[PDB]
Amino acid sequence: DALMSRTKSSLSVLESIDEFYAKRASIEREYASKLQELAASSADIPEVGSTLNNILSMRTETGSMAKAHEEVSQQINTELRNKIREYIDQTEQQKVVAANAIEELYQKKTALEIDLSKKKDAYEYSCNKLNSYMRQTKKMTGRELDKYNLKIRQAALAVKKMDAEYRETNELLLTVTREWIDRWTEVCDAFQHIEEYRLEFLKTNMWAYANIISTACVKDDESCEKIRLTLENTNIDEDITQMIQNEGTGTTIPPLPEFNDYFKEN
Amino acid sequence: FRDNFWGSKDAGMDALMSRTKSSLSVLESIDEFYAKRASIEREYASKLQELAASSADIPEVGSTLNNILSMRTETGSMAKAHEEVSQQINTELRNKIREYIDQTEQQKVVAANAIEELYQKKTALEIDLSKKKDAYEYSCNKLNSYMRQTKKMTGRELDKYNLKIRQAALAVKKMDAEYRETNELLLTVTREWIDRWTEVCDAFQHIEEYRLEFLKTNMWAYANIISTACVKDDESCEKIRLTLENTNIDEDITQMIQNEGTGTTIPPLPEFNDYFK
């Protein structure tokens, strides 16, 4: 009944899925965030002049350009902060090994001492093989072939010695397993501890996953509220006024043609 | 208020002809800015609904299967959220910029229609009035040269003076008909030129007080097209955390180990008194 394969297969499924979570986090920033982090800030932030002479209707354009960039400073944070959490999968994907390679090899050694001792017991099933040949002497003595009784002594002394083996191998193999019913309950209990705390790790480390992106959502949303604030301070009648002084060409009327006379210099 | 755009002759028109070409260069720079932001977000949703829908079969199952899958099914919510963003940018935002681009160029013709008619009519007279003042002040040099030579060479002789009255009629001729008249055709044109030009400055001022309000109301749409995604993403975050509060530790009740009735006493007892006794 080598059913340690079932509790040892539970360990094959604790790291083949932890790999997926760490693969997902490792992928949800290079296949998701290496785009906005890069494309938003990098491809943007030029010195292309807004060329709006309006000191105010220009505050809102750069405000839209700035908050495009103060939106990307927040997807970079997730790219950083969430690849500084996948590094907590390895403090479980390899810390669990500290909790499952210590009381596993220490339990393997005893688990095979049983295996050959029982094989030594089934090998010492000769108490039966000489009992079979003992009875067949007694069976054939009903015919009385006159000194089979000497043979019967032999198998009688033989049976005595060879069950003294069987009783010896049986009491030993008894406590070898009686001390394995005990110690196997300790791996049953220990595995149910760190296969129950792995779930608290999974749940608590995934609850801190959305709280890592919910920050990102509230960041750029709060930054979008800043594009509407910069967009409310605009007062237009003062704006063209400020813009006229720049592009102003002339304020006095083009004086009219007057008829120049003859006595100008007479 | 925009009366103060007169200047010398053509500075005003060219100062106002550069403002429209610069104003148009503001909106097209704003238009393209959406196009660049558009495909950026469009690439964001491509990868996400790729990443979300690229599901695979792994030994996970049970009440913890919800949370892991909750994470996969909310990366497709982001894609849907940010595809709408880019969608709302090229369909609504960019296209409505192309609206005011064309509406205004068609309105920038109606405003100043006959400006070059009067500007060139005013120039024709300006130079032609200068052609006439040119002759008038050459016509008076000769007269002075005939009334100043007679000044030093006084009337001490007997020569017919008809040189003066012959050319005095010229001075009146060239002056009156050709200067006091084209200086009055220029006046009536000028007084209308000031009128029409004053109404063209007023007409673009009104246009400029729209472009500023339009840009504000357009970028306000831009801000709220993004806030659409932000609350969508934020709401789908509690959906992750709603499915994490649903997780109790009973998934280890999903047991596969074959036990509970095994591990017997095992003191093998073949005494071989089964029959033999």
| Shortest CA gap A146–chain B (Å) | 22
How many angstroms separate the CA atoms of B116 and B258, rounded? 99
* Cβ burial, residue A187 (10 Å; 0-12/13-18/19+): middle
CB of A207 within 8 Å of any CB in chain B?
A: yes
Rounded to whole angstroms, the maximal C-alpha distance in chain B is 196
Across the interface, which of B51, B183, B247 has its CB nearest the CB of A27? B51
Q: Are B78 and B236 in contact (CB under 8 A)?
A: yes
How many angstroms separate the CA atoms of A183 and B142, rounded? 139
Written as six digits, the tokens of A133 are 């040949």
Lookup result for tokens 């095979």: A112
Mark yes or no for CB contact A6/B233 under 8 Å: no
Mark yes or no for CB contact B59/A16 under 8 Å: yes
CB proximity under 8 Å: A 116-145 to B: 121, 125, 127-128, 131, 134-135, 138
Task: Identify the three-state secondary structure at position B169.
Answer: helix
Mark yes or no for CB contact B15/A196 under 8 Å: no
Q: Are A202 and B70 in contact (CB under 8 A)?
A: no
Across the interface, which of A7, A71, A249 has its CB nearest the CB of B12? A249
Lookup result for tokens 């920038």: B108
CB of B201 within 8 Å of any CB in chain A?
A: no
At position A186, the amino acid (one-letter code) is E
Task: Identify the three-state secondary structure at position B54.
Answer: coil
DSSP chain A: --THHHHHHHHHTTHHHHHHHHHHHHHHHHTTHHHHIIIIIIT-----------TTTTHHHHHHHHHHHHHHHHHHHHHHHHTTTGGGTHHHHTHHHHTTSSTTHHHHHHHHHHHHHHHHHHHTTHHHHHHHHHHHHHHHTTS--S-HHHHHHHHHHHHHHHHHHHHHHHHHHHHHHHHHHHHHHHHHHHHHHHTTHHHHHHHHHHHHHHHHHHHHHHHHHHHHHHHHHTTTS--SHHHHHHHHHHH----S--PPP----SGGG-
Written as six digits, the tokens of B42 are 């469009």
Across the interface, which of A20, A50, A239 has its CB nearest the CB of B212? A239
Chain centre distance of CA A170: 48
Lookup result for tokens 């690439």: B43
Best of B148, B195, B230 to disrupt the A interface (most A CBs within 10 Å) is: B230
CB of A2 within 8 Å of any CB in chain B?
A: no
How many angstroms separate the CA atoms of B26 and A53, rounded? 11
Mark yes or no for CB contact B190/A256 under 8 Å: yes
Question: According to the entry, how was the structure determined?
Answer: X-ray
Q: How is chain B split into domains, by residue range? A: 10-253
Q: Are A223 and A74 in contact (CB under 8 A)?
A: yes
Closest CA to A256 of B226, B211, B86, B190: B190
Burial A245-261 (b: 16+ CB within 10 A, else e): eeeebeeeebeebeeee
* Cβ burial, residue A81 (10 Å; 0-12/13-18/19+): middle
Across the interface, which of A21, A196, A221 has its CB nearest the CB of B252? A196
DSSP B79-147: HHHHHHHHHHIIIIIIHHHHHHHHHHHHHHHHHSSSHHHHHHHHHHHHHHHHHHHHHHHHHHHHHHHHH
* Long-range contacts of the stretch A23-30 (C-beta < 8 A, 24+): A24/B71, A24/B72, A25/A82, A25/A83, A25/A85, A25/A86, A25/A89, A25/A209, A26/A83, A26/A86, A27/B51, A28/A82, A28/B51, A28/B75, A29/A78, A29/A79, A29/A82, A29/A83
> Torsion angle of alpha carbons B268, B273, B275, B276, nearest 10°?
130
Q: How far is CA A205 from CA A25, A127, A151, B72, B177, in A?
A: 12, 61, 78, 15, 100
Which are the contacts of A193, defined by CB distance < 8 A and separation ≥ 6? none
Kindly state the helix (H) or strand (E) to which residue B56 belongs, with its residue range.
Answer: none
How many angstroms separate the CA atoms of B176 and B140, rounded? 13
Give the number of C-alpha atoms closer than 13 A to the C-alpha of residue B111, restricted to the C-beta side.
Answer: 22
Mark yes or no for CB contact B212/A17 under 8 Å: no
At position B165, the amino acid (one-letter code) is I
For domain B10-253, say whether CATH 1.20.1270.60 is its number: yes
DSSP A1-13: --THHHHHHHHHT
How many angstroms separate the CA atoms of A75 and A36, rounded? 7
* Structural domain A3-247, CATH architecture: Up-down Bundle (1.20)
Mark yes or no for CB contact B36/A54 under 8 Å: no
Chain centre distance of CA A231: 44
**PDB resolution in Å:** 3.5
Closest CA to B86 of B36, B39, B148: B39
At position A138, the amino acid (one-letter code) is K
CB of A80 within 8 Å of any CB in chain B?
A: no
At position B18, the amino acid (one-letter code) is S
* Cβ burial, residue A145 (10 Å; 0-12/13-18/19+): exposed
